[PDB]
């Protein structure tokens, strides 16, 4: 289970969860498959940190294999909406949605550990029904793909054409390669 930790506050000793203690230091953890509930929890954490000190910059660690895109967009819009820069430090693994949030971090603050692995892929979805119903759902998936590619280009800085051809099939970009592609500014070796 989660291990309790002690903070030597001036008033007195207090017991906090390991995640809660780190949250007080503007540190959020994105762990596991992306989902509405976990993402909503991250959104709540961001708003709490914003009110405490909007001048300070939030930190976020992306170690996830990806998931639902709808929930992930709530974090993307929230990251840009809030004034604090949401630093992104990919640890271990990043997926299409995880990498999308990794690039969403403020310029100059995105990071990726040396042995971290990033992957980007086109949105995957399916629908079953009448031929007409398949068409409308297909349009949204294509629109999401187009919109996501446009957003990636803005943060990454690569041309839309380059991202589209690269994102058509799974592309595994290591941490050094990510800097070249532009997903991340630099690797985290010294603060």
């Amino acid at each position: 289970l989660v291990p309790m930790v002690i903070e030597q506050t001036s008033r007195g000793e207090r017991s906090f969860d390991i995640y809660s203690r780190l949250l007080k230091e503007r540190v959020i953890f994105l762990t596991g498959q992306v989902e509405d509930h976990m993402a909503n929890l991250i959104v709540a954490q961001m708003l709490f940190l914003e009110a405490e000190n909007p001048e300070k910059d939030i930190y976020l660690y992306i170690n996830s294999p990806g998931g639902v895109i709808t929930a992930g967009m709530s974090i993307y819009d929230t990251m840009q909406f809030i004034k604090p820069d949401v630093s992104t430090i990919c640890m271990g693994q990043a997926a299409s949605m995880g990498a999308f949030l990794l690039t969403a971090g403020a310029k100059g603050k995105r990071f990726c550990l040396p042995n971290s692995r990033v992957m980007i892929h086109q949105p995957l979805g399916g629908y079953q029904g009448q031929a007409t119903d398949i068409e409308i759902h297909a349009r949204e998936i294509l629109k999401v793909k187009g919109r996501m590619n446009e957003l990636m280009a803005l943060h990454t800085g690569q041309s839309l054409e380059q991202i589209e051809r690269d994102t058509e099939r799974d592309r595994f970009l290591s941490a050094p390669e990510a800097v070249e592609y532009g997903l991340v500014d630099s690797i985290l070796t010294h603060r």
Partner: protein
């Protein structure tokens, strides 16, 4: 602390106070006045949400929760304020200028300030969250800094005849001494 409040209950009802020294005091003729600053803190407090929400709280609401109803029962009357007026704040500049001008009278100095400048200076100093607390500091800062350099040796030593007026482009007061 709650114990501090407990002591107040004794004087309101008993009208006497007992301490370690054992000396008895008379509270028959004493008067008591208090001040609540909790409302001011909530006005500037930020809201944890995507969009900040206006909170036009009233003075009555704070005392209901922060203070036990027992105190309100013994309380005789509660007063409330919102803001004085827009014009009075302009007048506050004039009232301070009266005392400031009285100071110049001791030095045998005369100074005039533009009516428009007086209004803008009042607005700059006055704030809703801080009220008139910083107004005193800004009044002196406007003229004490420039006047100090030349009062030691200059026209201010004999009559002054100072003229003060703001600049539209720079919104900065200008000082000219004509003795």
């Amino acid at each position: 602390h709650p114990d501090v409040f407990n002591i107040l209950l004794q004087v309101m009802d008993n009208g006497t106070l007992t301490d370690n020294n054992g000396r008895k005091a008379d509270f028959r003729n004493v008067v008591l006045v208090m001040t609540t600053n909790a409302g001011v803190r909530e006005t500037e407090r930020k809201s944890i949400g995507l969009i900040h929400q206006d909170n036009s709280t009233d003075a009555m609401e704070e005392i209901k929760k922060i203070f036990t109803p027992e105190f309100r029962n013994r309380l005789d009357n509660i007063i409330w304020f919102d803001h004085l007026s827009t014009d009075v704040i302009h007048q506050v500049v004039d009232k301070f200028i009266v005392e400031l001008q009285v100071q110049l009278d001791q030095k045998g100095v005369s100074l005039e300030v533009s009516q428009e400048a007086r209004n803008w200076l009042a607005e700059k100093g006055y704030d809703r969250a801080m009220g008139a607390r910083p107004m005193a500091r800004v009044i002196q800062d406007n003229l004490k800094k420039p006047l100090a350099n030349e009062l030691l040796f200059g026209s201010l030593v004999d009559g002054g005849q100072v003229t003060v007026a703001l600049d539209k482009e720079k919104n900065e007061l200008t000082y000219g001494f004509q003795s």
